[PDB]
Amino acid sequence: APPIMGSSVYITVELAIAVLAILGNVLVCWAVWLNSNLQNVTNYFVVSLAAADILVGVLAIPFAITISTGFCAACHGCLFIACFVLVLAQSSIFSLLAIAIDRYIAIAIPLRYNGLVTGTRAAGIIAICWVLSFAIGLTPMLGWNNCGQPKEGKAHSQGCGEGQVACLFEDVVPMNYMVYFNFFACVLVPLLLMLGVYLRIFAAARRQLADLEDNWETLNDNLKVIEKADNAAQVKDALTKMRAAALDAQDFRHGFDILVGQIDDALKLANEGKVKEAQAAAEQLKTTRNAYIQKYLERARSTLQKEVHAAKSAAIIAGLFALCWLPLHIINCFTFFCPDCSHAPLWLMYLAIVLAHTNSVVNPFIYAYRIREFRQTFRKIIRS
């Protein structure tokens, strides 16, 4: 069948993806620029990720369409148009890893987060990451390429000139680079590190939510131990543990000041052998628990639930990046490791390439569906 027919479907789909990738990701950058509630370190990496996706639409997709023609080109020029998408994918990986680490620092050390993670340090990391992405993605232009062994028969059959080759990705980019360096070292290892970071985020949230519920239950159990106590020493023992737990957990500041103070009043009575007076003093702790401690617990639980929801949204984007790119990397593994296997057919290569590009369309949707602040800002931009 005429090659222009199958190429026409692939090209049209690529162009449709390029349009959506630019539109949705420009909307993400617009929302962050306009709304100060979206201007935070996590979202500076989100914008770096959206910039990489805009460049997939503007440059990587036109370059993929160009390569698909097999046009005559100087081998090192062909190599640049083949490798530029690897720069963008690498930058995306560094942005996804930075978002995961950012979310881990926020849940593991919230009191140190604002002094450790600043906009200035974030902008420096993003700049370094873009430089490293160019170094990794354009490593073949440093000599790890097949330009020293051109397919001269294919070049002559196409009427190419001297120093020119038929420009095809797998003719100029070495497959040992694609599998060992690009896939295993530069993609799979950071994705596995991201999985490890997300497991630590969810374990930290789970442990912190369990600790809030345990401290609340301990307060209520110790209040009952005091109510049923048969002597001053038993009231004292339960109060000494209540005081330590209260200090460990320490209008919310006023509530904890009242709580420790009331435990201290009861403990002083219990040390004087005044059981009944110590038990009546301990009952006052219920008023403080109802008016202050319960509100603290509900707010701390709600804050942890919002961090779990946010880390899930971030993990879904990292997982969707893995889902969209893995097929092309896996096809490269078959081409490389199985020279006795027929190469994956051209229609399957086009499908894997288009699926990898579709990753540049999906993040604006995940932000709109899962993040209220982005959802409302997108609605305001599209309306105004």
Ligand X SMILES: Nc1nc(-c2cccc(-n3ccnc3)n2)nc(-c2ccco2)n1
Ligand Y SMILES: CCCCCCCC/C=C\CCCCCCCC(=O)O
What CA–CA distance (Å, rounded) separates 257 from 243?
Answer: 11
Using a 10 angstrom Cβ sphere, with 0-12 exposed, 13-18 middle and 19 or more buried, the burial of residue 319 is: middle
What is the residue-wise DSSP string for 107-130?
HH-HHHHHHHS-HHHHHHHHHHHH
Q: Which two tokens stand for residue 52?
A: 């990489």
What CA–CA distance (Å, rounded) separates 240 from 236?
Answer: 6
55: contact with ligand X by CB under 6 A = no
Mask for 315-334, x = binds ligand CLR (CB under 6 A): --------x--xx--xx-xx
Contacted entry of ligand CLR, ligand Y, Na ion, none for residue 331, CB cut-off 5 to 8 Å set by kind: ligand CLR
Residue of 11, 141, 308, 344 interacting with ligand CLR (CB under 6 A): 344
Residues 6 or more apart whose CB falls under 8 angstroms from that of 60 comprise 84, 85, 88, 357
Residue of 56, 67, 155, 267 interacting with ligand X (CB under 6 A): 67
- Coil, helix or strand at residue 64: helix
Mask for 176-195, x = binds ligand Y (CB under 6 A): --------x------x--xx
Residue whose tokens read 């370190």: 41
Query: Which parts of 80-99 interact with Na ion (CB under 5 A)?
Result: 92
342: contact with ligand Y by CB under 6 A = yes
Mask for 142-181, x = binds ligand X (CB under 6 A): ---------------------------xx-------x---
- Coil, helix or strand at residue 165: strand
What CA–CA distance (Å, rounded) separates 321 from 96?
Answer: 9
What is the residue-wise DSSP string for 204-264?
HHHHHHHHHHHHHHHHHHHHHHHHT-SSHHHHHHHHHHHHHHHHHH--HHHHHHHHHHHHH
Using a 10 angstrom Cβ sphere, with 0-12 exposed, 13-18 middle and 19 or more buried, the burial of residue 113 is: middle
How near is the Cβ of 153 to ligand X at its closest, in Å?
19
Residues near ligand CLR (CB under 6 A) are 73-74, 77-78, 80-81, 188, 323, 326-327, 330-331, 333-334, 337-338, 341-342, 344, 348
Residues near ligand Y (CB under 6 A) are 6-13, 15-16, 26, 29-30, 32-33, 39, 44, 47-48, 51, 54-55, 58, 62-63, 65-66, 69, 71-72, 76, 119, 122-123, 126-127, 130-132, 134-135, 138, 141-143, 184, 191, 194-195, 198-199, 315, 318-319, 322, 326, 330, 337, 341-342, 345, 347-348, 350-351, 354
Residues near ligand X (CB under 6 A) are 64, 67-68, 85-86, 89, 169-170, 178, 328-329, 332, 349, 353
